[PDB]
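#struct-pred
JK: can someone run the complex with A1IAP? inputs below
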Amino acid sequence: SEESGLPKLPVPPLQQTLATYLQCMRHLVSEEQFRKSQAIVQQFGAPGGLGETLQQKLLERQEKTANWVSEYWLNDMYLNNRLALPVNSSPAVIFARQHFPGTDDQLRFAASLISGVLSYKALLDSHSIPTDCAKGGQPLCMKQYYGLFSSYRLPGHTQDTLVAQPEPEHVIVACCNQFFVLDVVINFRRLSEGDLFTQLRKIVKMASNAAARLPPIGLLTSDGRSEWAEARTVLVKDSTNRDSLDMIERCICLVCLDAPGGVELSDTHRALQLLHGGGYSKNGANRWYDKSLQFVVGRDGTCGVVCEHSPFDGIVLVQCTEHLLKHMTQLPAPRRLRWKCSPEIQGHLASSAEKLQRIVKNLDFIVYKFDNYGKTFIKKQKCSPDAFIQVALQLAFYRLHRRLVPTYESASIRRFQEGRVDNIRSATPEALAFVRAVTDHKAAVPASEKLLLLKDAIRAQTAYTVMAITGMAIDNHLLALRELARAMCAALPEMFMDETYLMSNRFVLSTSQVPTTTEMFCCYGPVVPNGYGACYNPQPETILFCISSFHSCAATSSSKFAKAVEESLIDMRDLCSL
Ligand SMILES: CCCS[C@@H](CC1C=CN(C)C=C1)c1cccc2ccccc12
Ligand code: NA
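RT: done, structure tokens with the ligand placed:
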């Protein structure tokens, strides 16, 4: 009645997780390091040993909590991360290209979008969104929907805070780096699209007035999390700033009326604008990255949403955005938020502009549309499209870099209460056997044998996927054992100080499938300096890859990786056509 009917997240058996862990890492560490890790794990999991003690504590935690990993996972994946949110953390979703002859066309789109946000939020708030079922079925957790609009991520010196929340409700409109409170309710009557248009015109006019222009405070939210915690602490010394921060913290979402980009509106360029606004000289300060959703409606027709994803993952977000876009197809003045700055704040602003520009220049990003085939061909090979593509990315990484690396693939655990994600470790032993056969010409493995190895790697990938989505994989389980150990003693046991364990969690290849039904697509940066981010959207006859890496790292190249992906998909096609 008041409590969820969903199952709780399972706790895997301890020995199952330790065995899977060792077999995951054997081929990714040296033989000497692996021998040491084998003995460490044996001691940790011995009868009556520490692992068994921690496992008992984890089963007590499962009984006392709705989800035993929620707190640890939120802190480990997001709130402890000190990197600036743009590129490093906040994914971008790019909508179909739009065409706005005049400003009023841009404003009519933004008015229509805001109206759809208000309608969707009314469905949400009255619990009218139909329960998702697995594979589009077993019911899925719906809690992430309540985090789409009611969430604000506060910076902290060492750990951030995720705050959940209002009479009336308002959005914040960002224009020319200025922020305006737009109430979306007058006399308890929701503003119509026409009223919203009229209000947005008032905002664009006020934002263009240089005598009222205020400093670009939003730039500070683009900095490292400890840097922005420090600058925000300066701001909150003044009551005007506290009032303005409070208005942003409690808004529904941001709507960002970006200026024209001046670059060709390719898919790659539109994505760059959604990821980091092009830096301070372009739209990079027209942002507030702590707020969960920042819809961008650019003057030139670049539209999308920038997502702070501590409160929700991408499947729920795409459900929301597709509903918004599909249903677009079917009076007091807004208040400028004022700011009281100091010489301190000017220094923080200049430093944030410089730090953001390093991120802009460092990001190597490419949108690559593979057009030779898609899901239809892959399914004719008795393969899951996701597993086939994951194996292709392993072959791409191996043929370019001549090793496999610890790889992350998001797996939804929404089958369980409060469920977010666990990790599918796609760098399997079977994937290694396959990529070596394909690339080692002197070994002269027959194509017929490469095909057997291909299908066994796809089998192993599919098996790991089922394991992860049913709560039986290893990353969340080890995370909880680690953090329960830390509560006993700040000195972690050797199990988690082991270089094999640290190595295992540096995801040089970080991936996810985010399928969409419209022309929209999702992207994000890498999670380690020598890594890639790879987000793909498989369609019946094509596959879209968004590949990121950092220009600082001489080993990686997004262009070269996309070419290796193409060659791998062609190789796999030829093997399946024997
Ligand atoms: C379970 C479905 C995908 S969850 C997340 C995946 C992910 C994101 C970043 N890295 C580095 C690696 C993986 C994600 C992807 C794309 C867009 C998102 C938008 C909002 C929220 C999450 C999004
Ligand atoms: Na690079």
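RT: quick notes.
The longest strand covers residues 363-370.
The chain has two domains: 1-66+367-578, 67-366.
JK: thanks, will look after standup
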